[PDB]
Tab-separated table of C-alpha atoms and ligand atoms in Angstrom:
chain	number	residue	atom	x	y	z
V	29	UNK	CA	44.056	1.717	25.605
V	30	UNK	CA	41.290	-0.005	27.598
V	31	UNK	CA	42.568	-0.354	31.203
V	32	UNK	CA	44.125	3.128	30.910
V	33	UNK	CA	40.946	4.956	29.865
V	34	UNK	CA	38.606	3.229	32.365
V	35	UNK	CA	38.993	2.351	36.037
V	36	UNK	CA	37.271	-0.900	37.044
V	37	UNK	CA	35.259	-1.052	40.274
V	38	UNK	CA	33.267	-3.915	41.906
V	39	UNK	CA	31.670	-6.709	39.860
V	40	UNK	CA	27.936	-5.888	39.257
V	41	UNK	CA	26.698	-9.240	37.766
V	42	UNK	CA	27.543	-12.414	35.924
V	43	UNK	CA	25.833	-15.378	34.288
V	44	UNK	CA	24.949	-16.520	30.785
V	45	UNK	CA	25.603	-13.020	29.357
V	46	UNK	CA	29.131	-12.769	30.884
V	47	UNK	CA	30.423	-10.332	33.539
V	48	UNK	CA	29.562	-6.707	34.264
V	49	UNK	CA	31.648	-4.321	36.416
V	50	UNK	CA	31.155	-0.861	37.821
V	51	UNK	CA	33.452	1.590	36.146
V	52	UNK	CA	34.596	5.173	36.046
V	53	UNK	CA	35.789	7.003	32.976
V	54	UNK	CA	38.894	8.976	33.741
V	55	UNK	CA	38.258	11.605	31.122
V	56	UNK	CA	35.573	12.830	33.490
V	57	UNK	CA	34.178	10.749	36.239
V	58	UNK	CA	31.077	9.379	34.457
V	59	UNK	CA	29.768	6.199	35.911
V	60	UNK	CA	30.005	3.394	33.321
V	61	UNK	CA	29.378	-0.312	33.183
V	62	UNK	CA	32.060	-2.592	31.730
V	63	UNK	CA	30.619	-5.690	30.020
V	64	UNK	CA	32.855	-8.655	29.225
V	65	UNK	CA	31.571	-11.193	26.739
V	66	UNK	CA	33.698	-14.184	25.836
V	67	UNK	CA	34.137	-14.964	22.110
V	68	UNK	CA	33.502	-18.674	22.723
V	69	UNK	CA	29.998	-18.037	23.971
V	70	UNK	CA	28.849	-15.740	21.154
V	71	UNK	CA	26.359	-17.682	19.011
V	72	UNK	CA	25.429	-14.694	16.897
V	73	UNK	CA	27.724	-12.274	15.062
V	74	UNK	CA	27.065	-9.273	12.845
V	75	UNK	CA	29.028	-6.613	11.007
V	76	UNK	CA	29.128	-2.803	11.396
V	77	UNK	CA	29.045	-0.155	8.602
V	78	UNK	CA	32.874	-0.237	8.163
V	79	UNK	CA	32.388	-3.987	8.043
V	80	UNK	CA	34.167	-5.550	11.046
V	81	UNK	CA	33.039	-8.872	12.519
V	82	UNK	CA	31.350	-8.076	15.888
V	83	UNK	CA	28.861	-9.714	18.313
V	84	UNK	CA	25.247	-8.979	17.368
V	85	UNK	CA	24.696	-7.103	20.664
V	86	UNK	CA	27.199	-4.479	19.451
V	87	UNK	CA	25.471	-4.107	16.069
V	88	UNK	CA	22.116	-3.711	17.871
V	89	UNK	CA	23.403	-1.417	20.641
V	90	UNK	CA	24.867	0.818	17.913
V	91	UNK	CA	21.567	1.105	16.028
V	92	UNK	CA	19.686	2.264	19.149
V	93	UNK	CA	22.411	4.343	20.822
V	94	UNK	CA	21.821	7.511	18.819
V	95	UNK	CA	20.128	10.353	20.700
V	96	UNK	CA	18.262	9.995	23.983
V	97	UNK	CA	15.844	7.175	24.939
V	98	UNK	CA	14.982	4.504	27.505
V	99	UNK	CA	17.831	2.312	26.248
V	100	UNK	CA	21.221	2.311	27.990
V	101	UNK	CA	23.765	3.516	25.407
V	102	UNK	CA	26.911	1.795	24.137
V	103	UNK	CA	29.626	4.407	24.805
V	104	UNK	CA	32.464	2.388	23.307
V	105	UNK	CA	33.628	-1.178	22.823
V	106	UNK	CA	36.946	-3.029	22.589
V	107	UNK	CA	38.095	-6.357	21.240
V	108	UNK	CA	40.511	-8.717	23.062
V	109	UNK	CA	41.843	-12.090	22.053
V	110	UNK	CA	39.090	-14.187	23.738
V	111	UNK	CA	36.486	-11.623	24.716
V	112	UNK	CA	34.712	-8.395	23.681
V	113	UNK	CA	34.471	-5.569	26.179
V	114	UNK	CA	31.606	-3.093	26.123
V	115	UNK	CA	31.470	0.263	27.883
V	116	UNK	CA	27.881	1.338	28.684
V	117	UNK	CA	26.100	4.132	30.604
V	118	UNK	CA	25.584	3.582	34.354
V	119	UNK	CA	22.854	5.508	36.217
V	120	UNK	CA	23.787	6.438	39.771
V	121	UNK	CA	22.078	5.291	42.062
V	122	UNK	CA	20.481	2.430	40.157
V	123	UNK	CA	18.452	-0.704	40.878
V	124	UNK	CA	17.031	-3.251	38.492
V	125	UNK	CA	13.278	-3.791	38.335
V	126	UNK	CA	13.559	-7.357	39.581
V	127	UNK	CA	15.040	-6.313	42.929
V	128	UNK	CA	12.709	-3.342	43.071
V	129	UNK	CA	9.618	-5.589	42.804
V	130	UNK	CA	11.282	-8.199	45.043
V	131	UNK	CA	11.699	-5.449	47.701
V	132	UNK	CA	8.246	-3.774	47.579
V	133	UNK	CA	6.079	-6.731	46.473
V	134	UNK	CA	3.419	-5.775	43.911
V	135	UNK	CA	3.573	-2.169	42.598
V	136	UNK	CA	0.894	0.460	42.934
V	137	UNK	CA	-0.992	0.849	39.682
V	138	UNK	CA	0.106	4.444	39.295
V	139	UNK	CA	3.750	3.368	39.596
V	140	UNK	CA	3.264	0.400	37.237
V	141	UNK	CA	1.555	2.660	34.655
V	142	UNK	CA	4.512	5.020	34.718
V	143	UNK	CA	7.088	2.253	34.439
V	144	UNK	CA	5.163	0.249	31.842
V	145	UNK	CA	4.699	3.349	29.691
V	146	UNK	CA	8.432	4.074	29.777
V	147	UNK	CA	9.071	0.472	28.722
V	148	UNK	CA	6.675	0.951	25.852
V	149	UNK	CA	8.541	4.063	24.732
V	150	UNK	CA	11.880	2.173	24.901
V	151	UNK	CA	10.613	-0.803	22.908
V	152	UNK	CA	9.097	1.536	20.293
V	153	UNK	CA	12.428	3.285	19.954
V	154	UNK	CA	14.200	-0.065	19.400
V	155	UNK	CA	11.527	-1.324	16.948
V	156	UNK	CA	12.057	2.009	15.223
V	157	UNK	CA	15.816	1.637	14.964
V	158	UNK	CA	15.200	-1.820	13.414
V	159	UNK	CA	16.161	-3.655	16.632
V	160	UNK	CA	14.171	-6.273	18.531
V	161	UNK	CA	15.345	-6.979	22.154
V	162	UNK	CA	13.610	-10.392	22.570
V	163	UNK	CA	14.085	-10.646	26.342
V	164	UNK	CA	12.077	-7.824	27.936
V	165	UNK	CA	11.720	-8.626	31.627
V	166	UNK	CA	12.110	-7.020	35.036
V	167	UNK	CA	15.790	-7.889	35.259
V	168	UNK	CA	16.655	-6.238	31.937
V	169	UNK	CA	15.208	-2.960	33.182
V	170	UNK	CA	17.319	-0.576	35.231
V	171	UNK	CA	15.717	2.212	37.249
V	172	UNK	CA	17.559	5.455	37.690
V	173	UNK	CA	16.312	5.942	41.269
V	174	UNK	CA	16.649	9.770	41.182
V	175	UNK	CA	15.007	10.766	37.908
V	176	UNK	CA	12.518	7.869	37.919
V	177	UNK	CA	13.790	6.926	34.445
V	178	UNK	CA	13.701	3.288	33.306
V	179	UNK	CA	16.399	1.865	30.968
V	180	UNK	CA	16.727	-1.339	28.882
V	181	UNK	CA	19.957	-3.263	29.215
V	182	UNK	CA	20.708	-6.579	27.711
V	183	UNK	CA	20.671	-6.967	23.904
V	184	UNK	CA	22.425	-10.323	24.059
V	185	UNK	CA	19.428	-12.285	22.658
V	186	UNK	CA	18.460	-9.417	20.363
V	187	UNK	CA	17.988	-9.611	16.586
V	188	UNK	CA	17.371	-7.197	13.741
V	189	UNK	CA	13.681	-6.533	13.284
V	190	UNK	CA	12.237	-8.195	10.185
V	191	UNK	CA	8.685	-9.062	9.109
V	192	UNK	CA	9.203	-12.757	8.479
V	193	UNK	CA	9.054	-15.560	11.043
V	194	UNK	CA	11.685	-16.156	13.752
V	195	UNK	CA	12.719	-19.722	14.481
V	196	UNK	CA	15.366	-19.155	17.198
V	197	UNK	CA	14.807	-17.927	20.770
V	198	UNK	CA	17.227	-17.250	23.562
V	199	UNK	CA	15.285	-15.223	26.079
V	200	UNK	CA	13.820	-16.855	29.173
V	201	UNK	CA	11.290	-19.621	28.711
V	202	UNK	CA	8.671	-18.562	31.265
V	203	UNK	CA	8.571	-15.331	29.225
V	204	UNK	CA	8.210	-16.979	25.776
V	205	UNK	CA	4.876	-16.829	23.873
V	206	UNK	CA	2.616	-19.854	23.278
V	207	UNK	CA	3.414	-19.890	19.487
V	208	UNK	CA	7.064	-20.507	20.402
V	209	UNK	CA	6.233	-23.273	22.859
V	210	UNK	CA	3.991	-25.058	20.321
V	211	UNK	CA	5.564	-24.401	16.924
V	212	UNK	CA	9.111	-23.150	17.457
V	213	UNK	CA	8.196	-20.026	15.451
V	214	UNK	CA	7.019	-16.419	16.171
V	215	UNK	CA	6.936	-12.883	14.768
V	216	UNK	CA	8.785	-10.050	16.617
V	217	UNK	CA	6.111	-7.451	17.404
V	218	UNK	CA	3.462	-9.885	18.623
V	219	UNK	CA	5.976	-11.851	20.705
V	220	UNK	CA	7.219	-8.583	22.244
V	221	UNK	CA	3.641	-7.732	23.151
V	222	UNK	CA	3.236	-11.088	24.846
V	223	UNK	CA	6.346	-10.560	26.987
V	224	UNK	CA	5.099	-7.039	27.747
V	225	UNK	CA	1.942	-8.660	29.083
V	226	UNK	CA	4.131	-10.876	31.298
V	227	UNK	CA	6.045	-7.809	32.447
V	228	UNK	CA	2.840	-5.960	33.294
V	229	UNK	CA	1.321	-8.837	35.298
V	230	UNK	CA	4.588	-9.120	37.174
V	231	UNK	CA	4.636	-5.404	38.025
V	232	UNK	CA	1.136	-5.506	39.505
V	233	UNK	CA	1.153	-9.033	41.007
V	234	UNK	CA	4.635	-9.395	42.474
V	235	UNK	CA	4.999	-12.555	40.410
V	236	UNK	CA	4.901	-13.881	36.796
V	237	UNK	CA	1.664	-15.582	35.621
V	238	UNK	CA	2.894	-18.850	34.057
V	239	UNK	CA	5.610	-21.289	34.960
V	240	UNK	CA	5.189	-24.505	32.923
V	241	UNK	CA	4.567	-24.973	29.251
V	242	UNK	CA	0.959	-26.209	29.805
V	243	UNK	CA	0.137	-23.001	31.707
V	244	UNK	CA	1.612	-20.853	28.899
V	245	UNK	CA	-0.260	-22.847	26.220
V	246	UNK	CA	-3.480	-22.700	28.254
V	247	UNK	CA	-3.067	-18.901	28.678
V	248	UNK	CA	-5.402	-18.575	31.654
V	249	UNK	CA	-4.505	-15.659	33.887
V	250	UNK	CA	-5.210	-15.663	37.613
V	251	UNK	CA	-4.861	-12.600	39.812
V	252	UNK	CA	-3.458	-13.197	43.283
V	253	UNK	CA	-3.679	-9.484	43.993
V	254	UNK	CA	-6.366	-6.748	43.825
V	255	UNK	CA	-5.967	-5.255	40.299
V	256	UNK	CA	-8.406	-2.893	38.603
V	257	UNK	CA	-11.007	-4.151	36.185
V	258	UNK	CA	-8.870	-2.362	33.570
V	259	UNK	CA	-5.324	-3.449	34.093
V	260	UNK	CA	-6.646	-6.958	34.050
V	261	UNK	CA	-8.093	-6.306	30.614
V	262	UNK	CA	-4.862	-4.840	29.155
V	263	UNK	CA	-2.826	-7.701	30.618
V	264	UNK	CA	-5.274	-10.237	29.170
V	265	UNK	CA	-5.227	-8.621	25.734
V	266	UNK	CA	-1.382	-8.696	25.578
V	267	UNK	CA	-1.552	-12.361	26.634
V	268	UNK	CA	-4.149	-13.388	24.019
V	269	UNK	CA	-3.180	-16.873	22.757
V	270	UNK	CA	-3.541	-16.114	19.073
V	271	UNK	CA	-0.830	-13.569	18.086
V	272	UNK	CA	-3.188	-11.580	15.797
V	273	UNK	CA	-5.512	-10.986	18.813
V	274	UNK	CA	-2.780	-9.091	20.682
V	275	UNK	CA	-2.611	-5.308	20.602
V	276	UNK	CA	-0.122	-3.178	18.695
V	277	UNK	CA	2.086	-0.782	20.663
V	278	UNK	CA	-0.258	2.016	19.756
V	279	UNK	CA	-3.325	0.215	20.991
V	280	UNK	CA	-1.551	-0.575	24.281
V	281	UNK	CA	-0.648	3.082	24.685
V	282	UNK	CA	-4.243	4.114	23.875
V	283	UNK	CA	-5.654	1.693	26.372
V	284	UNK	CA	-7.942	3.292	28.998
V	285	UNK	CA	-5.503	2.075	31.727
V	286	UNK	CA	-2.585	3.873	30.084
V	287	UNK	CA	-4.311	7.305	30.472
V	288	UNK	CA	-2.750	10.133	32.529
V	289	UNK	CA	0.642	8.498	32.986
V	290	UNK	CA	2.983	10.348	35.338
V	291	UNK	CA	6.266	11.919	34.196
V	292	UNK	CA	9.456	10.183	35.431
V	293	UNK	CA	10.420	13.061	37.761
V	294	UNK	CA	7.037	13.092	39.595
V	295	UNK	CA	7.158	9.303	39.624
V	296	UNK	CA	10.401	9.476	41.572
V	297	UNK	CA	9.068	12.221	43.886
V	298	UNK	CA	5.926	10.223	44.760
V	299	UNK	CA	7.276	6.667	44.656
V	300	UNK	CA	11.084	6.740	45.039
V	301	UNK	CA	11.885	9.761	47.295
E	428	LIG	O1	24.185	-3.156	36.243
E	428	LIG	C1	24.086	-3.747	35.157
E	428	LIG	C2	24.236	-2.995	33.887
E	428	LIG	C3	24.512	-1.549	33.904
E	428	LIG	O2	24.595	-0.917	35.095
E	428	LIG	C4	24.649	-0.848	32.710
E	428	LIG	C5	24.549	-1.492	31.464
E	428	LIG	C6	24.302	-2.871	31.344
E	428	LIG	O3	24.211	-3.466	30.101
E	428	LIG	C7	24.125	-3.689	32.584
E	428	LIG	C8	23.864	-5.164	32.550
E	428	LIG	O4	23.774	-5.773	31.460
E	428	LIG	C9	23.709	-5.912	33.831
E	428	LIG	C10	23.428	-7.380	33.863
E	428	LIG	N1	23.317	-8.071	32.692
E	428	LIG	C11	21.989	-8.391	32.174
E	428	LIG	C12	21.318	-9.587	32.858
E	428	LIG	N2	20.318	-10.211	32.023
E	428	LIG	C13	19.951	-11.589	32.249
E	428	LIG	C14	19.441	-12.200	30.956
E	428	LIG	O5	18.087	-12.639	31.127
E	428	LIG	C15	23.284	-8.019	35.126
E	428	LIG	C16	23.385	-7.343	36.353
E	428	LIG	C17	23.649	-5.974	36.400
E	428	LIG	N3	23.726	-5.331	37.585
E	428	LIG	C18	22.610	-4.452	37.919
E	428	LIG	C19	22.523	-4.078	39.383
E	428	LIG	N4	21.722	-5.063	40.096
E	428	LIG	C20	21.558	-4.902	41.532
E	428	LIG	C21	20.580	-3.783	41.854
E	428	LIG	O6	19.319	-4.224	41.347
E	428	LIG	C22	23.816	-5.203	35.136
E	429	LIG	O1	12.133	-14.693	36.530
E	429	LIG	C1	11.686	-15.835	36.772
E	429	LIG	C2	12.305	-17.018	36.080
E	429	LIG	C3	13.452	-16.907	35.101
E	429	LIG	O2	14.000	-15.705	34.787
E	429	LIG	C4	13.985	-18.047	34.487
E	429	LIG	C5	13.486	-19.324	34.745
E	429	LIG	C6	12.423	-19.528	35.635
E	429	LIG	O3	11.975	-20.786	35.845
E	429	LIG	C7	11.767	-18.387	36.358
E	429	LIG	C8	10.619	-18.586	37.323
E	429	LIG	O4	10.175	-19.738	37.540
E	429	LIG	C9	10.000	-17.402	38.023
E	429	LIG	C10	8.852	-17.534	39.000
E	429	LIG	N1	8.268	-18.718	39.311
E	429	LIG	C11	7.063	-19.097	38.571
E	429	LIG	C12	5.827	-19.437	39.403
E	429	LIG	N2	4.752	-18.461	39.261
E	429	LIG	C13	3.445	-18.776	38.704
E	429	LIG	C14	2.811	-20.036	39.272
E	429	LIG	O5	3.041	-21.089	38.327
E	429	LIG	C15	8.327	-16.395	39.602
E	429	LIG	C16	8.820	-15.117	39.343
E	429	LIG	C17	9.882	-14.869	38.464
E	429	LIG	N3	10.283	-13.583	38.281
E	429	LIG	C18	10.475	-12.684	39.404
E	429	LIG	C19	9.608	-11.433	39.355
E	429	LIG	N4	10.128	-10.355	40.187
E	429	LIG	C20	9.704	-10.234	41.575
E	429	LIG	C21	10.540	-11.062	42.559
E	429	LIG	O6	9.715	-11.908	43.375
E	429	LIG	C22	10.538	-16.023	37.742
């Protein structure tokens, strides 16, 4: 039922997470992405309502895929003998935020404020649906080039949101909070806020702030680019060393720098058309 309902196009990516292909649904020609994950490499399983044994990513994608948001939706999934196959939305034309920043260098503040805000909305929606992504970064963000809408993509290192400590981490190191580096333990919200601080610095600086553990643990932030007294403050607050000194989502979104965000459409008009 799988290779009959969907027509595979070119490979889009591959790596730790598996392989992703461009796809068309025959039913009607909606762009889709086809994500192959091999059973052997799944470290983390869950179970759906009806109680089947699936990869966590599927559990998580299902909890966030209801209604609209800034998260790319799971349209359907299939099991095979050595792999799971996931059918997801595909914006058209699309480019990931990594390449986007790579191409234009640092982003104008107005453009960063728009993008960052949309990320905030997406992460809120996930936190809301009891999901924690745990790997927010430029390359897990797709941009729908036409509508100026951002979308989150890879739940592979995700986990259900819970209020107790986490002692496993699979996201990228350079993006991991100092409490992880030092103690091999973190809480979800505050660690998300840290990575959001990394994401924001990246957007405005062209680059990430820290590379090596000692730089992460030190937590000192240098700007290689002109950035407003105020973005610098928000970035620094997100990257506070002590988790409890970081802002909540709400405080981020009420930050002076987050005022008068653009809508995605006008963002595209001004910065993508
Ligand atoms: O295109 C997707 C994609 C999609 O279109 C719809 C849903 C999805 O879940 C994906 C997707 O997961 C994807 C890639 N996997 C995530 C890489 N994460 C690295 C872990 O740190 C890795 C690469 C990838 N290709 C994006 C296109 N990149 C070139 C233009 O920037 C994708
Ligand atoms: O994404 C990584 C990265 C990763 O995903 C996994 C392992 C890694 O070691 C990196 C990484 O080193 C990296 C960058 N280099 C760090 C040096 N910058 C601060 C000076 O210490 C500098 C930038 C960077 N991200 C690219 C940001 N997007 C714009 C493209 O230039 C990375």
